[PDB]
Amino acid sequence: KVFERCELARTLKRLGMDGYRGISLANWMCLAKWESGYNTRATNYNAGDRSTDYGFFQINSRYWCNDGKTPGAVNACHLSCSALLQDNIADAVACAKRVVRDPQGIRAWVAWRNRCQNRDVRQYVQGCGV
């Protein structure tokens, strides 16, 4: 599913993502925009460590989900990676909350640091009424 900007903003909000652990909704939006363009079926394989990133948040299989084909994988989110390619984002949001509970916070995602950190991200939610 390819969410439309404000449709995702409103949903992330009802799922308690706005201000989750100090992270603004505009920031979760910025991450999602650069990670998948709001596409829940997005995937990216990493030849280096043989892992794959899944979903709109691009959650990696080496540490967060189990896809059954990644060496030395840990399943911190305790979920099949396939659960993160679904139209219903409840599981992706729950697993994103776990990722940010770690010391690094949202800085775990390189795209966020390169494209969102310390920048104006208000555009991501302006007009959504959130």
Long-range contacts of 21-24 (CB under 8 A, 24+ apart): 21/97, 21/100, 21/101, 21/105, 22/105, 23/100, 23/105, 23/106, 24/121
Burial (CB < 10 A; 0-12, 13-18, 19+), residue 16, is exposed
Q: Name the CATH topology of 1-130.
A: Lysozyme (1.10.530)
Catalytically annotated residues: 35, 53
Residue ranges of the domains in the chain?
1-130
What was the structure determination method? X-ray
The two structure tokens encoding residue 55: 């979903």
Phi-psi region of 105 (alpha: psi -120 to 50; beta: other; left: phi over 0): left
Q: Within 10 A of 113 (CB to CB), how many other CB atoms are there?
A: 13
Alpha helices in the chain, H assignment, sequence order: 5-14, 25-36, 90-99, 110-115
Strand ordering across the sheet containing 59-60: 43-46, 51-54, 59-60
Specified resolution (Å): 2.2
CB 56 within 8 A of CB 36: yes
- CA distance from start to end of the chain: 21
The two structure tokens encoding residue 28: 């979760």
Buried b (16+ CB within 10 A) or exposed e, 85-107: beeebebbbebbbebbeeeeebe
